[PDB]
């Protein structure tokens, strides 16, 4: 009986890896979305002090994760009927007013796909994107 | 004479670090923007095959870069009359139809602020965001 974590959250209502539906809507032109589940990839302090959250769009199916920007998630844990794909290229930043409700939750191993795929997708690879 | 680079671009019309104005507009709720210059933080292949581009919003002045999510840029090179701030928390993804025109250009040092600030801001730190 030692609370390393509490019965609700750390303090942050938005937890990293806790999936929120978001009204990703009035997306411009070729931006993909509408009200869909999104993945919270964001830092810790953004939840605390910023009104803005960075998220990545979830897609049911689209194309096999053959590209380092597409990552797939197990229907089994992620609670869909189908294995879903996260598009690390099709991301955005949405303020807390856009986030509706906690739906789903990611695994630590997919955290690593997510964080990491993201840097390939966004070219910030810590080894330099010109060095592969 | 040995063209390691050509007289225009590599092939990509959008170069990483080449600043485009963007119609960042119909931003939702508390999203910050309108038509403004944005920073191309994106990878290399997104320019080639994806219609989408990831960018971060440029702001004139707002608050001193005391937060690892705020980075400042020299008016001198960046071609403004004021030192501008890039907000790595206030970013988004915009398709090539949003990008208007090349304005400005970043330095390699600021590249490193940008790539790096970004992982703090988005919690994907390659050392884990829980390990500082």
UniProtKB/Swiss-Prot annotation, chains A, B:
InterPro entries: PemK-like, Plasmid_toxin/cell-grow_inhib. It holds the Pfam family PemK_toxin. The keyword Heme does not apply. Keywords: Endonuclease, Hydrolase, Nuclease, RNA-binding, Toxin-antitoxin system. Disulfide bonds: none annotated. GO terms for molecular function: DNA binding; RNA binding; RNA endonuclease activity. The keyword ATP-binding does not apply. One of its GO terms (biological process) is rRNA catabolic process. It is an enzyme of class 3 (hydrolase). It comes from the Bacteria. Its EC number is 3.1.-.-. Belongs to the PemK/MazF family. Toxic component of a type II toxin-antitoxin (TA) system. Ribosome-independent, sequence-specific endoribonuclease that cleaves mRNA, thus inhibiting protein synthesis and inducing bacterial stasis. It cuts between the first and nucleotides of 5'-UACAU-3' in single-stranded RNA. Neutralized by coexpression with cognate antitoxin MazE. Homodimer. Forms a complex with MazE which is no longer active as an endoribonuclease. This is Endoribonuclease MazF. It comes from Staphylococcus aureus (strain MW2).
